[PDB]
Design a protein around this ligand. Structure first.
Ligand code: UQ9
Ligand code: NDP
Ligand code: SF4
Ligand code: SF4
Ligand code: SF4
Lengths: 157, 94, 385, 165, 54, 324, 181, 112, 80, 316
């Protein structure tokens, strides 16, 4: 297996290159964090230049950015949309509200962090995080995706 | 000669193969709206009009004035029908 | 009649907008909005905060018009305390209120345009928004939730050179509006999407509690900056644009003209800006300077009290309203003599405006619903609180 | 009204003239320079007042600045700060626990304003996204690490901002 | 200290806020005549090309 | 016939590369209009962005929802993609550069355009979504509505040429390009192509923010990719048709030896590129009509004017005996 | 049309049994009415030539647990015709229904729904009276003083049931009340 | 449609109680299909649950308290039908489908 | 060779043409400025030492303020 | 509770229900996973912040095994496979790992409770190779740890089960459901949540579970035909039972078993036609009257009808 491992590593690297260079997030803009994310997709920061294209349907989406406060009323709608994303999928939590409840943590109507509803891959801190802070968080998502060995793990299974 | 249609058939076969390859590789790793019927009716009428224009357009050089005016009468009948459509609100989707 | 359920869980239309529409074909018969998807219990939470700790909550109500709600809360507290605000703070507060109005109108006009298929103006406008957000950050250190306007004045003085940078922005912004207008105003597609859509009569606007552009579109000359002026608005020149048809097209033109008049106010504020203190000097609600707190016993005691207990507000109740970018923003504040508000009711213009969607969208097409929502300029942070 | 002005609008409608200007002005920015920042090689501008990642500071001798007054804890609008304290072996009033929930925090800067000894500050760092919720529960040692890393920039901003506060 | 951010002596330069006009565009008749003449001359050219093709 | 599949692949594969790079070109042009950069990180100047996006879609898991029409759901993107591909078998790029020299090529192209509607309608009903179905119905109605004007414009060109052979249609423009005497007809044709391709200002399937769900909302992975590739291949084809019928195809601008030096394939490619630029420039310039407004335009403006131009051109040609 | 005129004019022209209390102050003119006269008083203010109170700005409740009628319903109103504001208030308890003014001001519809949701005050003749802000199936009226800040239940996703479910609250760090009095 | 005035007397209030009982209990077959309770509980067991809630308040004599209870009952019913939050063994507030009580509590915890 | 797959790095190399080297930090990151006026006179950038696996967090504190235009002092002057 | 549990094989079907119930008790749960970091992702939602910790490990490496066990006082083993891969045989996945885990648990010394989850029918004289290897692991873990506890659940029914889901998928694709033994084999399927509850109860007892083996079956005994009837009324589809005697059932299940250890690439997993499970269908598998049932654990199983078969709604 001195030659299979080299080939497998190249296959996984090719798959990771495709997945990092083509991330199509579906925006879950619940509150003020959505406006900073709007700016990240604008001319100054141009998320399109990184290959990021925003999708309206979870069916064409690879990532979900939860940007804003999640209420108990909205929580089931968030879970349903996440369940319609096809694999592989990632979730980014943006802002204090989505991270752990933020300013509204002790409220009777607010979910104390979106990670109680969906698994979260990256937490972006701030209230709101700056547009550049979101861009850094997306680059951290690329770093985690670059650690995947999906072909190798499937080959040894 | 129909000889130029064989490459089209081979082209269709190859395009189908490419489509099947592309679509198969990932498997490895109670309300009736009458206006749609109406738009279908109008499309059918004008599609037949385009059909009768093709022989006429390629044949204008030999039918001369008679064929021109016979087509004009055909269009006149169909345009009376179209005006009836217009006035009855079939062309308005509001 | 079938029911079309439309919830865009993405900021194409507000992110948490949820509409149940009863349709006869493609014509809307009834539009029922379902809200509370962003209800966060702000009014309950405020009762557990000191008057200072409650201030950041107002930034997050209409999160496109942050400093405007800061201003309304500070004015209400100042009203109950009978606190004199120095003149320099008044000019700064008005200056950033008008900057906030442009920031709001730029987002409201181009997100609406983007929803009806005009994608370029949003990019051109958000670049101008970035220049204005830079002024937010230079005075407060925060791009959006500045918490800069406070009872008795403003948190800090302007950094050196900021006024010159603001003036540079004003020298070119009229061309930016001109470009926005040329992409939209004369275009026959834009007119066909907006003209005679969502017509509101003056009586209907009054009946449904409409305010701001929603009320002035219907020909009613009503602007709180002139009807009930505050800060230095009575010393400034600006015109109040009014509509003649009450349709989505009028309200589009009014927001463009309001941006031009906002530019006019900023220029006057820049030239009339006087020197002096930017905090009120009553040593009861104003934090002392870092140097005196570390040198004078009386200042250290005052600093200890203000950041632990806060200031008390004598028992009373009043309603205070300002001309926010989206309309009349009001606060009904009840005090019981303690350092925490007993009751803080927030009057959001979008609450009244979104309630008017049913009569505004009657007998229109499905594609006009988004246009009418865009002309109402809804942000659900203030609707739901 | 008049055959000329009737002809004027008929031609303007048929020939789509007003859509010509829309095309013309859309093309002018095409050949112009772009405003996009080449992140992460290039960064957006920020001010010395920027409210970012929290940090605990020390005196130049190495002693902590914080004296466990708990003013920052009392003023924090999000209740993101938890403090425990007792007298140190040398008699000093020092914290034994200083926690900031970065997921409750609203980055308001009120804690920095309340601190009487300039111990807690919001630094200029804004790039600290994490893969776990746990890493955003900052403890005292993490905050003092942040202050050690960012001390030279923080001290410079404090000198520049001292003339305003 | 005693130095605060504000206007320069004399104030800043005046700025325009009103919309600026722009008179760019041909005339109803000019573009009509162009289209009509192009049509007439071009269809004559079509006839000539059809004769040579024959 | 053993060499025919080589020619077929030499047509198809560069067409797929061209589509993949048309999507990149549209993103780059819209961005440059908007003072931004567009894809520029994945490869030098973003040139590897199409490869990454296609490879991403290939690796994405296919959902294939729990519908009762699983075969039709998957066959719908294959139908529209095959139809988009097969139109290029009769397109000439230069004198003798064409796979099938069909004598009925014009009517064959009309037939392909008429067939295109089925992928969209089948996607809507097979997707088990009321929102996808009503969007597919609207899109299908718009396409058939603008097919009438496209056909009438084709008849006008046919009267000028008197033959359904595309190469003969090009060679009939040696004396003068048809776009000069038929400029309004060319404008109408370009707008009818925009509406027929579901392109801005007529892009109902992109009007999700308008509460108007597209026909392909329930599609993921390569079914969605096939729909997208079909639409962009159709955009390239419509640019080619605008070039062939009105801009002289592979012919040079002036019949001079200086122009005759560069190959006619380069002329044809340049003209196609100019129309592909217009498709993007228009997408970047204007907002979109409502469905009722564009349907009104199709039946009340473009059909009457197309019929009028057929009558006028035929009458003038038979009057002065200038017929082919 | 200043606050002095309205106070003096209203005393002369209004029916005496309608108003129990009248306050003139810089914090706002304020009429305190009985529950059974609230509707008629607001109709008078809206229709009368010398008042023309055409805009209902908002309706809000206030909780006073020490009072036998704990709730106070506050009506904030505006006259654009005369550029003046007026406040009308009335008291209520947890079981007394009060008249709805939707027929007078259509904007009252949602505000009365919010008062019911937040406080539990019901409104006679309200066309569609249901909760508007809280989650579906909510128990309690959160703006009441006795209602706990964090409420009674919280939500989370439960994998075995494959859904979001509601459970009684369990806080990692309880809300710390700081008594600075 | 609209919210009615408060019931004048106990005859009016009890009449309103029966209309609510009829309306709430008539919706059991809708509730059975919504929560898929066919193999979980019989319709009669949920009918007896509603009746039991009404009987547990049979001692109320103030008609205004009865009116408020019915209004809250209609709202509870509407949320169960219109916006169902399906758990397994509950609908809304109601569970569906040799030592005294001191030792059991004592073994559990010190807080009773 | 990194220019071919990494277009982000290529943009920096193109824009580095004609720039002035300001300083180098302890990690080897190189700091450049242009002294023009194209994005409102903001012409400061960093060429990271690692041509692959570069990260925004690799900029030390002494150069962070210069890079974000917070201060006009370079990293060298702050360290002195 | 102060229980720190290292649950091996928790990224499978039973794992998610076991981790949820262990999280409810307050226990800290360590989740070893051997492949992608995505496999344990759904488990991070369970439990409060930091209570569930996935940890990469290697089955064929003892340094990694003791790394994930080094902080635990409870070890639960759910590792096993009903089919054969070219890299892991039935003895490799069902016996070698289980015996290896106990020896490292013995080397640890701090393991108060050890539970090995086997299968009902795990016997030496079993036609199926997998059950034979399970019984070997039954004896091996008992010999390595006589204080350990064993569970023997029957076919588990749940959302992610491999009996009702493969049949329903097979029906919606071919229109008919095969019966391998004429629909005559008897067995008593058990709700998966009940199996998870039993493991929790054994961890929660005063120590009476240690050293004992529990046969956990459903409340009622079906035949395969009768179970196939439940889903038909659930998936609201017309019943089309096509019989299939055992010879030909072993015919179409022969290839994958034949060519698993010869080809150098992976193969799709068998659903209905798994030669090993087909062999186990020859004889009825039931809870013995002399063993320890759900009673003596003070738990009552759920009936299959209703909630345990609610996941079949998605197939209508
Ligand atoms: C935002 O809008 C956009 C999309 O849809 C929404 C896109 O799909 C896309 C991109 C989609 C593509 C580039 C699909 C390209 C597919 C092709 C060119 C045909 C196949 C090409 C490949 C590199 C795949 C090769 C596959 C194989 C199985 C190898 C066989 C040899 C972009 C760029 C976009 O901007
Ligand atoms: N019907 C049933 O499901 C019944 C099952 N049982 C037994 O109970 C146990 C748990 O059942 P269930 O959860 O359904 O099983 P699954 O097959 O669904 O899950 C098995 C688990 O073990 C892991 N695993 C499997 N093979 C290996 C290997 N070779 N090396 C390392 N890890 C491995 C898997 O990890 P990964 O996902 O990474 O492969 C997974 O976490 C098994 O031993 C099973 O045989 C008992 C009776 C009936
Ligand atoms: S984290 Fe802050 S900015 Fe973001 S949504 Fe919450 S309150 Fe608004
Ligand atoms: S920034 Fe504000 S919310 Fe965050 S710790 Fe400091 S005071 Fe508390
Ligand atoms: S950080 Fe400052 S305010 Fe907070 S406890 Fe320490 S000294 Fe007091």
């Amino acid at each position: 297996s001195k030659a299979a491992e080299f080939v497998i590593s190249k296959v996984d690297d090719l798959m990771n290159w495709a997945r990092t260079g083509s991330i199509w997030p579906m925006t879950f803009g619940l509150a003020c964090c959505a406006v900073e994310m709007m700016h990240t997709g604008a001319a100054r920061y141009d998320l399109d230049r990184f290959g990021i294209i925003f999708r309206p349907s979870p069916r064409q989406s690879d990532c979900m950015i939860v940007a804003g406060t999640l209420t108990n009323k909205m929580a089931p709608a968030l879970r349903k949309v996440y369940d319609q994303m096809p694999e592989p999928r990632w979730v980014i939590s943006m802002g204090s509200c989505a991270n752990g409840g933020g300013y509204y943590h002790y409220s009777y109507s607010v979910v104390r962090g979106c990670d109680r509803i969906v698994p979260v891959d990256i937490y972006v801190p701030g209230c709101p995080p700056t547009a550049e802070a979101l861009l850094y968080g997306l680059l951290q998502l690329q770093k985690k995706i670059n650690r995947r060995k999906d072909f190798l793990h499937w080959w040894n299974k | 000669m129909m000889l130029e249609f064989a490459p089209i058939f081979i082209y269709l076969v190859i395009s189908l193969l490419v489509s099947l390859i592309l679509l198969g590789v990932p498997f490895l790793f109670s309300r009736f709206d009458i206006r749609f019927y109406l738009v279908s009716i109008l499309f059918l009428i004008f599609d037949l009009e385009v059909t009768f224009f093709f022989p006429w357009a390629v044949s204008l050089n030999k039918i001369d004035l008679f064929g021109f005016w016979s087509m004009m009468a055909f269009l006149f009948i169909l345009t009376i029908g179209f005006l009836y459509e217009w006035k009855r609100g079939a062309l308005d989707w509001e | 009649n079938f029911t079309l359920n439309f919830g865009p869980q993405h900021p194409a239309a507000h992110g948490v907008l949820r509409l149940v529409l009863e349709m006869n074909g493609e014509v809307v018969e009834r539009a029922e909005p379902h809200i509370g998807l962003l209800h966060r219990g702000t009014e309950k939470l405020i009762e557990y905060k000191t008057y200072l700790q409650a201030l950041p909550y107002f930034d997050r109500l209409d999160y496109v018009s942050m400093m405007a709600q800061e201003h309304a809360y500070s004015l209400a507290v100042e009203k109950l305390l009978n606190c004199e605000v120095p003149l320099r703070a008044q000019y700064i507060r008005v200056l950033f209120c008008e900057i906030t109005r442009i920031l709001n109108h730029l987002l409201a006009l181009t997100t609406h345009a983007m929803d009806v298929g005009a994608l370029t103006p949003f990019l051109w406008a958000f670049e101008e928004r970035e220049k204005l957000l830079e002024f937010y950050e230079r005075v407060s250190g925060a791009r959006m939730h500045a918490s800069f306007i406070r009872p008795g004045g403003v948190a800090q003085d302007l950094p050196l050179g900021l006024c010159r940078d603001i003036d540079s922005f004003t020298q070119q912004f009229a061309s930016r509006i001109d470009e926005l207008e040329e992409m939209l105003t004369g275009n026959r597609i834009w007119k066909q999407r907006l003209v005679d859509i969502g017509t509101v009569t003056a009586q209907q606007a009054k009946d449904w509690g409409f305010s701001g552009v929603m009320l002035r579109g219907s020909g009613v000359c009503w602007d709180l900056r002139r009807a009930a002026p505050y800060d230095v608005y009575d010393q400034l020149d600006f015109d109040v644009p009014v509509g003649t048809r009450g349709d989505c097209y009028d309200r589009y033109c009014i927001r463009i003209e309001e941006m031009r008049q906002s530019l006019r106010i900023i220029v006057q504020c820049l030239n009339q800006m006087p020197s002096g203190m930017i905090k009120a000097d009553d040593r009861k609600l104003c934090p002392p300077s870092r140097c005196r707190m570390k040198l004078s016993m009386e200042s250290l005691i005052h600093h200890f009290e203000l950041y632990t207990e806060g200031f008390s507000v004598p028992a009373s109740s009043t309603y205070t309203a300002v001309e926010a970018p989206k309309g009349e923003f009001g606060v009904f504040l009840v005090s019981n003599g303690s350092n925490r508000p007993y009751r803080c009711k927030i009057r959001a213009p979008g609450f009244a405006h979104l309630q008017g969607l049913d009569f505004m969208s009657k007998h229109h097409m499905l594609a006009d619903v988004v246009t009418i929502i865009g002309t109402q300029d809804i942000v659900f942070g203030e609707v739901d609180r | 009204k008049d055959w000329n002005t009737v002809f004027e609008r008929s031609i303007n409608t048929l020939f789509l003239t007003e859509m010509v200007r829309g095309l013309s002005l859309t093309l002018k920015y095409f050949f112009d320079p772009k405003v996009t920042i080449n992140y992460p090689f290039e960064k957006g501008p920020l001010s010395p007042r920027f409210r970012g990642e929290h940090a605990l500071r020390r005196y130049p001798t190495g002693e902590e600045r914080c004296i466990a007054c708990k003013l920052c804890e009392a003023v924090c609008p999000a209740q993101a700060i938890t403090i425990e304290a007792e007298e140190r072996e040398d008699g000093s009033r020092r914290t034994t626990r200083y926690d900031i929930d970065m997921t409750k925090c609203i980055y308001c800067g009120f804690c920095q304003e309340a601190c009487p000894v300039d111990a807690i500050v919001e630094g200029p760092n804004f790039e600290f996204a994490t893969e776990t919720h746990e890493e955003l529960l900052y403890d005292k040692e993490k905050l003092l690490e942040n202050g050690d890393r960012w001390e030279t920039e923080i001290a410079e901003n404090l000198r520049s901002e001292s003339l305003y506060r | 200290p005693l130095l605060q951010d504000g206007p320069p002596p004399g104030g800043f330069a005046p700025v325009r806020y009103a919309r600026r006009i722009s008179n760019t565009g041909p005339s109803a008749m000019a573009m009509f005549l162009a289209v009509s003449g192009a049509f007439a001359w071009g269809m004559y050219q079509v006839g000539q090309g059809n004769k040579i093709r024959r | 016939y053993i060499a025919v599949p080589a020619e077929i692949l030499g047509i198809i594969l560069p067409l797929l590369l061209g589509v993949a790079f048309l999507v990149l070109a549209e993103r780059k042009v819209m961005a440059f209009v908007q003072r931004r950069k567009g894809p520029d990180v994945v490869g030098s100047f973003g040139l590897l962005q199409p490869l990454a996006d296609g490879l991403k879609l290939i690796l994405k898991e296919p959902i294939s929802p729990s519908s009762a029409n699983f075969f039709l759901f998957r066959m719908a993107p294959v139908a529209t993609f095959m139809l988009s591909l097969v139109a290029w078998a009769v397109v000439p790029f230069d004198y003798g550069m064409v796979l099938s020299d069909l004598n009925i090529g014009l009517l064959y192209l009309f037939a392909i355009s008429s067939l295109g509607v089925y992928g969209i309608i089948i996607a809507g009903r097979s997707s088990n979504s009321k929102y996808a179905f009503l969007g597919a119905l609207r899109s299908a109605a718009q396409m058939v509505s603008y097919e009438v004007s496209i056909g009438l414009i084709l008849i006008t060109v046919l009267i000028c040429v008197g033959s359904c052979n595309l190469s003969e249609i090009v060679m009939a423009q040696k004396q003068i390009w048809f776009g000069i005497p038929l400029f309004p007809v060319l404008v109408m044709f370009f707008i009818s192509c925009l509406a027929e391709t579901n392109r801005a200002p007529f892009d109902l399937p992109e009007a999700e923010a308008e509460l108007v769900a597209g026909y392909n909302v329930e599609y993921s992975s390569m079914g969605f990719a096939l729909f997208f590739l079909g639409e962009y291949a159709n955009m390239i084809l419509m640019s080619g048709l605008c070039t062939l019928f009105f801009l002289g195809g592979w012919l040079p601008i002036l019949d001079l030896p200086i122009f005759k030096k560069i190959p006619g394939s380069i002329w044809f490619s340049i003209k196609v590129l100019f129309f592909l630029f217009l498709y993007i420039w228009v997408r970047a310039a204007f907002p979109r009509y409502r469905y009722d407004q564009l349907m009104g335009l199709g039946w009340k403006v473009f059909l009457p004017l197309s019929l009028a131009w057929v009558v006028s051109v035929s009458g003038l040609l038979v009057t002065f005996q200038w017929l082919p | 049309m200043d606050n002095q005129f309205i106070f003096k004019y209203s005393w002369e022209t209004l029916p005496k049994k309608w108003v129990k209390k009248m306050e003139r102050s810089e914090h706002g003119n304020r009429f305190d009415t009985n529950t059974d006269y609230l509707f008629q008083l607001l109709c008078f203010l809206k229709l009368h030539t010398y008042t023309r109170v055409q805009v209902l700005i908002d309706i809000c409740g206030v909780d006073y647990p020490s009072r036998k009628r704990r709730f106070e319903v506050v009506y904030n109103l505006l006259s654009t015709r005369y550029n003046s504001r007026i406040r009308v208030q009335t008291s209520a308890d947890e079981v007394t229904r009060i008249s709805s003014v939707v027929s007078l001001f259509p904007s009252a519809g949602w505000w009365e729904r919010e008062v019911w949701d937040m406080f539990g005050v019901s409104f006679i003749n309200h066309p569609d009276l249901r909760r508007i802000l809280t989650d579906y199936g909510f128990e309690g009226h959160p703006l009441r003083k006795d209602f706990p800040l964090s409420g009674y239940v919280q939500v989370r996703y439960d994998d075995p049931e494959k859904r979001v479910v509601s459970e009684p609250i369990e806080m990692t760090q309880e809300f710390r009340y700081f008594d600075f009095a | 449609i609209g919210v009615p005035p408060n019931s004048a007397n106990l005859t009016e209030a009890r009449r309103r109680v029966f209309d609510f009982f009829r309306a709430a209990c008539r919706s059991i077959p809708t509730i059975m299909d919504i929560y898929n309770l066919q193999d979980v509980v019989a319709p009669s067991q949920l009918r007896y649950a509603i009746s039991a809630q009404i009987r547990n308040n049979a001692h109320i004599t103030d008609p205004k308290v009865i009116d408020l209870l019915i209004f809250k009952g209609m709202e509870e019913l509407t949320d169960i039908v219109d916006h169902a939050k399906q758990r397994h063994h509950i609908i809304g507030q109601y569970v569906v489908g040799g030592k005294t009580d001191f030792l059991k509590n004592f073994y559990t915890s010190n807080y009773f | 060779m990194r220019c071919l797959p990494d277009g982000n790095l290529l943009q920096t190399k193109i824009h580095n043409i004609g720039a002035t080297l300001v300083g180098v930090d302890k990690f080897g990151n190189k700091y450049y400025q242009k002294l023009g006026d194209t994005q409102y006179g903001r012409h400061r950038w960093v060429e990271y030492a690692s041509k692959d696996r570069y990260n925004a967090s690799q900029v030390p504190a002494e150069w962070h303020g210069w890079l974000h235009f917070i201060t006009d002092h370079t990293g060298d002057e702050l360290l002195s | 509770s102060g229980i720190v549990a290292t649950v091996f094989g928790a990224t499978g079907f039973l794992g998610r229900y076991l981790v949820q119930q262990l999280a409810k008790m307050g226990s800290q749960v360590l989740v070893p996973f051997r492949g992608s970091e995505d496999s344990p992702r759904h488990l991070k939602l369970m439990g409060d912040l930091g209570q569930v910790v996935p940890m990469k490990f290697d089955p064929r490496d003892e340094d990694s095994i003791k790394a994930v066990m080094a902080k635990a006082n409870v070890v639960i083993n759910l590792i096993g496979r009903e089919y054969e891969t070219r890299n892991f045989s039935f003895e490799d996945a069902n016996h070698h790992i289980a015996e290896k885990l106990a020896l490292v648990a013995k080397e640890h010394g701090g393991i108060m409770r050890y539970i090995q989850v086997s299968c009902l029918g795990a016997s030496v004289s079993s036609p199926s190779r997998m059950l034979r290897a399970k019984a070997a692991a039954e004896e091996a873990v008992l010999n390595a740890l006589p204080e350990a506890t064993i569970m023997r659940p029957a076919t588990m029914i749940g959302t992610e089960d491999r009996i009702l889901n493969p049949w329903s998928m097979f029906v919606k694709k071919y229109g008919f459901l095969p019966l391998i033994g004429g629909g005559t084999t008897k067995f008593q399927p058990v709700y998966v949540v009940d199996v998870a509850a039993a493991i929790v109860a054994a961890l929660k007892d005063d120590g009476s579970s240690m050293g004992k083996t529990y046969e956990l079956g459903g409340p009622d005994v079906f035949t395969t035909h009768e179970l196939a009837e439940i889903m038909y009324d659930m998936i609201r589809e017309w019943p089309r039972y096509v019989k299939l005697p055992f010879p030909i059932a072993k015919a179409m299940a022969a290839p994958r078993d034949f060519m698993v250890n010869k080809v150098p690439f992976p193969l799709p997993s068998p659903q209905i036609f798994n030669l090993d499970q087909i062999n186990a269908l020859t004889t009825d598998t039931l809870v013995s009257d002399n063993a320890l049932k759900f009673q003596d654990l003070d738990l009552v199983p759920h009936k299959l009808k209703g909630y345990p078969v609610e996941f079949l709604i998605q197939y209508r």
